[PDB]
Design a binder for this molecule. Structure first.
Ligand SMILES: Nc1ncnc2c1ncn2[C@@H]1O[C@H](CSCC[C@H](N)C(=O)O)[C@@H](O)[C@H]1O
Ligand SMILES: Nc1ncnc2c1ncn2[C@@H]1O[C@H](CSCC[C@H](N)C(=O)O)[C@@H](O)[C@H]1O
Lengths: 220, 220
């Protein structure tokens, strides 16, 4: 099951990930994407935010620093533990499969749910539908993801791929991930009962290609 | 003014265009894009359609063949004349600048307005807003355009470009055209008071890249 292999790669890569993210090894993040998601969230003035696939918690901390109550959830223990050791906030351990079935309590009545480069699997509709249920009326899901066109690599078609982490400092195990087209993302949002209200393509002033695709979708 | 130079290139290229389109010289059209726009239109079961920038009228004819009342409008006389000589339908001569200001009567209360590779200029919001006014409540604008990612040519940024028609049979004058990003298209729709309700990226089964971007937006 490539979805189980995906989460398993995170268990193997968690430490390398903490080091990369915190030490500032990922140029796209510090130059464009961290700010892009932060500004998209702050723009909605949420009071309660759930960070889905929060990893080691950099976004939980950035939101706490601005007075926002942020709750995190992630499926990897090393990342969850690191997020908790780095801050005062609530971080839950849960897999997406558990969340899709509402099997793990992670709070509810969220103004906003964010997923920052955290939805890399194939069957995401049930998870997204589960997240909708956790939103207050008029709440929003904010997703930042790899830009489909920038990472198409000559094959613009939905399908499994493998990331070797060749450019990253540290030692990594390959990660299987599901590539999806723009149309496929928007279909998923729609099938999950979410309406796209904003689409941005964050891009550094000196870059020729966008660094990510950032979408905001509302409950209804 | 690159927008005037654009329309002027059409006056020079009109005959080459008629020949290319009718003789079946454009592979993307016969293999993917003609069907894509036709099916998107037929799917909404319109009774009255305005084809904006109708050219020589192939779409007017395809819709008439299915019992739909299609009215065309175009800014070039050679194309308008050819469209009229090829069918029983109504074709109006009008520039987009005239239409943006409601200066030329082209009918109203349209169920659907379609623009097939017809919006190649920079300032399109006023035209799109004018088109909205011509829609019945719940009517739709259907736009098929070059796929922003496929034609970015390493420079994903809004700006003027020039098409030489290198791959096309016939003799052509260069056409200035405005490249816009995906985010910029959706912003334009939004500013025009139109809501995106569907996005597709027509692509031949054996193609690695999409051939077009097809969007449907509703009045409201
Ligand atoms: N099936 C699954 N269930 C739970 N979490 C998962 C998961 N698959 C991937 N993840 C989590 O998704 C994250 C992807 S890395 C992104 C982390 C964070 N949002 C950030 O911006 O830094 C990892 O923390 C990983 O553990
Ligand atoms: N400023 C302008 N005002 C009116 N028509 C314009 C225009 N700029 C371009 N056009 C028209 O836009 C068309 C682009 S070619 C596409 C034609 C047609 N929709 C088809 O699918 O075949 C031409 O017919 C051209 O005359």
């Amino acid at each position: 099951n490539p979805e189980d292999a995906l989460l398993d790669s995170w268990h193997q890569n968690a430490q390398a990930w903490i080091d990369a993210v915190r030490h500032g090894a990922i140029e796209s993040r510090r130059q464009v994407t961290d700010q892009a998601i932060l500004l998209a969230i702050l723009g909605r003035q949420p009071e309660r935010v759930l960070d889905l696939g929060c990893g080691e918690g950099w976004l939980l901390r950035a939101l706490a620093d601005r007075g926002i109550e942020a709750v995190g959830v992630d499926g990897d223990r090393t990342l969850v533990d690191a997020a908790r050791a780095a801050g005062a906030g609530e971080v839950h351990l849960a897999s997406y499969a558990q969340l899709a079935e509402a099997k793990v309590p992670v709070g509810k009545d969220y103004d906003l749910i964010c997923a920052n480069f955290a939805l890399l699997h194939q069957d995401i509709i049930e998870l997204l539908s589960a997240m909708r249920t956790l939103l207050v009326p008029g709440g929003a899901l904010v997703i930042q993801t790899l830009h489909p066109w920038s990472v198409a690599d000559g094959d613009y078609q939905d399908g499994w791929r493998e990331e070797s982490f060749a450019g990253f400092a540290g030692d990594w195990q390959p990660m299987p991930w599901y590539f999806r087209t723009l149309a496929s993302w928007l279909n998923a949002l729609d099938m999950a009962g979410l309406r796209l209200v904003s689409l941005q393509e964050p891009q550094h002033p000196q870059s020729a290609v966008p660094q990510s695709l950032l979408m905001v979708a509302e409950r209804h």
